[PDB]
Amino acid sequence: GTGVLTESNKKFLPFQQFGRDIADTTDAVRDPQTLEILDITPCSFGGVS
Amino acid sequence: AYTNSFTRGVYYPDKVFRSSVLHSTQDLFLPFFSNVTWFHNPVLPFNDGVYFASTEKSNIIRGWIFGTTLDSKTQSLLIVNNATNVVIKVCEFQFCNDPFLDVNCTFEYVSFKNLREFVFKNIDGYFKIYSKHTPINLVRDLPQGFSALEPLVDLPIGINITRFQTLLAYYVGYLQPRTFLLKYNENGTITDAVDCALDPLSETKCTLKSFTVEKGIYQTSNFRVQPTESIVRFPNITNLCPFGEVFNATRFASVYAWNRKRISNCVADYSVLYNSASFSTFKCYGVSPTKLNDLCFTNVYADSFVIRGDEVRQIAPGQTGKIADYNYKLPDDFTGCVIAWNSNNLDSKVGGNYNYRYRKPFERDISTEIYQAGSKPCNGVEGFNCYFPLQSYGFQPTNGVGYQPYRVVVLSFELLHAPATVCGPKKSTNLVKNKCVNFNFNGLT
Amino acid sequence: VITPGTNTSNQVAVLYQGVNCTEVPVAIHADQLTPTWRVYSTGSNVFQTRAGCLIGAEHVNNSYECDIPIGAGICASYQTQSIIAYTMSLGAENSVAYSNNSIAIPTNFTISVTTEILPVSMTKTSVDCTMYICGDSTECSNLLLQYGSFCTQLNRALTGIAVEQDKNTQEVFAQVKQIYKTPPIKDFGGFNFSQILPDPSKSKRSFIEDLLFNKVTNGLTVLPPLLTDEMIAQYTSALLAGTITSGWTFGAGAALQIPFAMQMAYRFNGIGVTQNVLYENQKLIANQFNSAIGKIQDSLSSTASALGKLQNVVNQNAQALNTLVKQLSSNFGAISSVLNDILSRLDKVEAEVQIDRLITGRLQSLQTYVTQQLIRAAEIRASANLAATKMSECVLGQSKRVDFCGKGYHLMSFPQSAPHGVVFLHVTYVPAQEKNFTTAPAICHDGKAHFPREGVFVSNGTHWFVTQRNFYEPQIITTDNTFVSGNCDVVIGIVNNTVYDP
Amino acid sequence: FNGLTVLPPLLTDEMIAQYTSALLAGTITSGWTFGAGAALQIPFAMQMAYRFNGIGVTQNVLYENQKLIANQFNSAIGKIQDSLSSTASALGKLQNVVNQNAQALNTLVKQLSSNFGAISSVLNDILSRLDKVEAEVQ
Amino acid sequence: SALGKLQNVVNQNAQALNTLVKQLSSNFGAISSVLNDILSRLDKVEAEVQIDRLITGRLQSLQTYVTQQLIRAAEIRASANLAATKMSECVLGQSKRVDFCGKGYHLMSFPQSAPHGVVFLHVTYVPAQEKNFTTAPAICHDGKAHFPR
Amino acid sequence: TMSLGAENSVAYSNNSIAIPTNFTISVTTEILPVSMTKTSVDCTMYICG
């Protein structure tokens, strides 16, 4: 996807690879080369008036 | 011997973190309060997958074997905890089920007050293991309480497992496709679950996606009376249809004067046609050939002729060309089958067989009047742009494949509307009344 | 499935709607071919009803109020324990003590405060429908051009809904020309508004507005309302401070001050109770009001389920957006719901056929959402038009429309703001302690038939009096209390009595 | 009946008639008082005297004309029966609720007979005649 | 600027009809949005596939229009029911309902017709030039309390 | 930031009243929409031309 990757406080279990939101959108990931957890945000959008 | 499974045997269905949320999931699960068999060993079926558990703090129970035979003739899983490691291979092992103390190979891998629990399943060509270990206070039955199992292993091996056995107290139960509602806490663990089919309150919890429900009346489901039996009602004909008089007729007609045979008052078997290696093409339009033996028809008409192999493509709805535009046409909504074969082994003659000739839907016309292709009123005289309407196919045994003779048969189906007269080989049942049944009247299911 | 709440019991009863009980255990249920609906051939009892076959509930010949409604006059409840089923009762029976000369007159009253909650506005929303349908994929966005104006009139529709929510809010609260503010002193004749007036320690909401705000609890974008919650609270403060210091006069012109005990004496004349009844009972009336406002604080402290209308607007907006987002995961018959799978697995000529299924299903899913939002906004607008009318007729006036501004004869009402809506505290006079009296339509004196100018004739059994209709207060009958029309013979049920001439 | 169902009302017609009876018995025996508290009895000819003051006609006008006013009412309720007994088309508002719902369900059921471009409008024809790969498209 | 409610009724219906006409130019996935191109270029079995895309799109286009017109008609009915109530209460009577027939104490009102609507000229009494006074709830004379009638 | 109106402290006290000594007759205009433009669409001619 496209997004802003960020550091996070989320407590994944050792076998868990990525996290999902209430509506099943992916919103966190484990980095496979150093096993810390990143929090994912959409890149900003909105109407222009 | 049997034991109640309680709320045992739930596992993390996917490798996804979720928190403070209720997730509805469908998977192969051990149903709540099912009967789990108890043992103190036999070969057992694997079915859709297994939940396995034992009372263990000793390694008296070393491991498991799995496969079709679980022995010699083909690849089979051996899994052993040898106290140094988990040891795995999938070889064609011929060794007996007693390697333990008295107390090819296409893949390989290496890695009481207590109960040890496992799930084994085999999906998408991959073999999966999940596990848990816990303290307990009863050896003689499974602990009534909740604890989710987490994955260990996920092998690419593709083996069609159907049986397994234990290697030397233990419990075995079978997974089934069910919907569960799983409670994820703040820290990513499954902490409770609902088996939705267990009772109407569990249906209500799963309908609301909630572990508590308020006072009220909730629609959870729909009800139907189900069919008690299956009824088949067909005409009582035993006469077989004379298809040999079509497909093995001595002389086939010309494409300009195509011949029609009515088929009636008989039991057909289209497998006798469709199984045959005799046919170079076999295509059906408003029906699939695999379904024909289930159907019944008011009439069947066989239309047949010989034609040049390259032109056989014109014998379909929506086509155009000389044979389609002047000799024979199917309607563009045609319901039926077209069959043909290369007939150079019978139809050809060394001078080119002069008997075979070409010039609305299901028209036929044998009129001999000259083509007045020119502005001339040709008045029965041939010449430049004045020609007899028929031309002959040059069918000789030396012809190249597109120029060879092919024999053609088209079967046209009159559907059930009036009472039917040509049926597939379906055996009629006795008739049952006032009960709910499945039924089939002449193909009307 | 009928449930007492899992808070209370795990027992249930099951209703098979329109089915006959002779079929039920011979079906998908119990002792026949049974897809998933596992066995309970009886749950404890089986009982045929006009609504369907009812399983696991106990039939009862009593008739309670309807706890859980089953249909066709049947209800169910949890009692001495088991689930019971019964024919519901409509209310207590009452043969009124009517006769051609008996009247009942109330000798005392209660001031009553009742709370009415009204929705006023939805959450505002807008969707970048190209970014919803196609997720910023270029191959999809080129196919979406073939559909023309659809993903443009969707935004024109949602823009009309969004602009209307700010109109709905302005029609209700902006009914005041000037921001009126309360005096420093609070000498309102012993009435105590401190729990509904603004709190300088607080936004600067009242104590009750703080309860109300506590109890209610992509390509898609959510827009801010035009008036902030602090502006909404300055309008409810101005409406309330005008109402307390000036009566209805701030609605008809410039606010004219009046003492609050004299404003309430006018509210008493408005319901047809003689104004001395307030000045003679002022401390009692003030205590009944102060006590009644105290019960509102307790009622709003006890449960959130009082505000179920406002919590429904919150819940419906969330449910609709969750469904609109979940529908991105659906196939609609396509090879995958992930748009980048289709573009990477297939050549263009196959990919365009598979992508147009996702475009078709997502475009249909978004048109379904916008249609449902247009229908829901029309319901919220009808509620905002009612709240705007209750502001003018109940808050800025004194309504004489029965049951419009709560039950009993209306005195006044006060607005408090709440999330997505408004709350009216309707204050009303309820008569409370009636006595029976004998009555006559007229009295005959020197042949002249006398009728009361205002009020009714009554007798205690030995003496005749004239009294006002809504509060028992007897006066001796005199030529200033009555008027004459004709002689005794025309009037049915006239009685002979003295009329005094002062 | 193809998955269509009609649910019963909660209040049956005899329960609706018990409510209109209670409203009407309260109105006749107690005037407006049962809407603002507990019902207070008052004689009906004396309730009508208050209804006359409410329209700005002085209440002596009722008592001086009570038998005339009672006859004009009793005769007016006679004309209601004759009107409803003659002219069922007076209830056109209620009858259109029935007709609109019947037209809506008949259109919903008739649409099952439509092909929408499939081989047949009948789902069991497709499943009898075509094998799975071909049937799914229909 | 005052009659913007009635001018919006005209504009809403004009945009709806122009949107409905403009959608005839859309392909919806056909080779052309002009039906005679399909019928002249493609023979019948090929042509039906393309025409069914235009049928599906043009039918969805028209269902979208009629559904938005049904919702817009219900909105105008609520306004016509209010205008009918304003005529009975304000024009045929004198309404005591606060702010129903304009601001101030309502005296009377007059109807004037306007295209697609109605206009009420509401006549109201507005009080003016207030003065402050001392006031009392009651008066004592011979030991007894007097109140104003 | 928008202004909600002029701020005003009403001169309230337990014995003061204000009474209007004059009036103005006011005429106010209220506009209401009552009907749409009546339409018919022949869907065979719109869809198939």
Ligand SMILES: *[C@@H]1O[C@H](CO)[C@@H](O[C@@H]2O[C@H](CO)[C@@H](O)[C@H](O)[C@H]2NC(C)=O)[C@H](O)[C@H]1NC(C)=O
């Ligand atoms: C009836 O006679 C007409 C000629 O009068 C036949 O017309 C031909 O039909 C085929 C159909 O594929 C066309 O390709 C030819 O071009 C037609 N010929 C002419 C000169 O137009 C017709 O086939 C006959 N119908 C029947 C039922 O026999």
Ligand SMILES: *[C@@H]1O[C@H](CO)[C@@H](O[C@@H]2O[C@H](CO)[C@@H](O)[C@H](O)[C@H]2NC(C)=O)[C@H](O)[C@H]1NC(C)=O
């Ligand atoms: C009218 O009703 C009120 C209650 O609503 C009565 O007031 C109570 O009177 C008793 C003594 O009789 C006191 O113990 C209570 O504390 C009073 N309550 C309040 C709120 O003051 C009142 O007495 C009744 N009046 C008549 C004439 O019956």
Ligand SMILES: *[C@@H]1O[C@H](CO)[C@@H](O[C@@H]2O[C@H](CO)[C@@H](O)[C@H](O)[C@H]2NC(C)=O)[C@H](O)[C@H]1NC(C)=O
């Ligand atoms: C108006 O009523 C409120 C209560 O609703 C009074 O406030 C309470 O006053 C007592 C005694 O001073 C305190 O013990 C409480 O803590 C107060 N409660 C709150 C929430 O503030 C208030 O004093 C009354 N006002 C007047 C002028 O008497």
Ligand SMILES: *[C@@H]1O[C@H](CO)[C@@H](O[C@@H]2O[C@H](CO)[C@@H](O)[C@H](O)[C@H]2NC(C)=O)[C@H](O)[C@H]1NC(C)=O
């Ligand atoms: C009806 O009302 C009258 C006036 O209030 C009552 O007459 C008074 O009765 C008391 C004793 O109860 C005497 O002390 C007074 O002197 C009487 N006054 C007059 C003017 O007669 C009468 O008792 C009441 N009747 C009933 C049955 O209660």
Ligand SMILES: *[C@@H]1O[C@H](CO)[C@@H](O[C@@H]2O[C@H](CO)[C@@H](O)[C@H](O)[C@H]2NC(C)=O)[C@H](O)[C@H]1NC(C)=O
């Ligand atoms: C009211 O008082 C009058 C007298 O002032 C009563 O009239 C008498 O009625 C009786 C019975 O009908 C007659 O025999 C007398 O001749 C009447 N007397 C006079 C002087 O006319 C009248 O009946 C009383 N009304 C009621 C309701 O008791």
Ligand SMILES: *[C@@H]1O[C@H](CO)[C@@H](O)[C@H](O)[C@H]1NC(C)=O
């Ligand atoms: C990956 O390799 C680097 C060294 O190349 C090492 O520092 C890092 O810890 C490794 N991470 C994992 C998850 O193995």
Ligand SMILES: *[C@@H]1O[C@H](CO)[C@@H](O)[C@H](O)[C@H]1NC(C)=O
């Ligand atoms: C099967 O399981 C149920 C509990 O769900 C138990 O009551 C029953 O006795 C078991 N039957 C056998 C044959 O073990």
Ligand SMILES: *[C@@H]1O[C@H](CO)[C@@H](O)[C@H](O)[C@H]1NC(C)=O
């Ligand atoms: C366990 O297995 C490994 C090979 O998988 C072997 O080297 C080791 O010696 C074994 N240990 C024991 C105790 O048998």
Ligand SMILES: *[C@@H]1O[C@H](CO)[C@@H](O)[C@H](O)[C@H]1NC(C)=O
């Ligand atoms: C090994 O595999 C081949 C087929 O790949 C099979 O013919 C042979 O019998 C197998 N041998 C053993 C010992 O399993």
Ligand SMILES: *[C@@H]1O[C@H](CO)[C@@H](O)[C@H](O)[C@H]1NC(C)=O
């Ligand atoms: C599993 O069985 C299928 C036939 O159903 C066969 O095609 C496949 O090769 C088998 N795979 C293994 C590894 O046994």
Ligand SMILES: *[C@@H]1O[C@H](CO)[C@@H](O)[C@H](O)[C@H]1NC(C)=O
């Ligand atoms: C969640 O994890 C934290 C440490 O990250 C721990 O302190 C806390 O007790 C855990 N809570 C639960 C409910 O497991």
Ligand SMILES: *[C@@H]1O[C@H](CO)[C@@H](O)[C@H](O)[C@H]1NC(C)=O
């Ligand atoms: C045609 O004859 C051959 C034997 O010559 C036979 O096998 C075949 O079944 C016959 N065809 C049909 C349709 O029975």
Ligand SMILES: *[C@@H]1O[C@H](CO)[C@@H](O)[C@H](O)[C@H]1NC(C)=O
């Ligand atoms: C059950 O619900 C009621 C309110 O419906 C509540 O008063 C009661 O405390 C609840 N019971 C429990 C065990 O919380």
Ligand SMILES: *[C@@H]1O[C@H](CO)[C@@H](O)[C@H](O)[C@H]1NC(C)=O
């Ligand atoms: C229920 O079904 C039976 C036949 O099984 C029938 O006799 C009975 O009258 C039916 N009762 C109702 C209320 O439908």
Ligand SMILES: *[C@@H]1O[C@H](CO)[C@@H](O)[C@H](O)[C@H]1NC(C)=O
């Ligand atoms: C309840 O009512 C039925 C008749 O409706 C009667 O047969 C039965 O005896 C009654 N039972 C009780 C306990 O009243």
Ligand SMILES: *[C@@H]1O[C@H](CO)[C@@H](O)[C@H](O)[C@H]1NC(C)=O
């Ligand atoms: C009035 O009196 C009758 C008896 O004469 C009694 O039945 C009724 O309950 C009384 N009503 C009131 C309101 O006191």
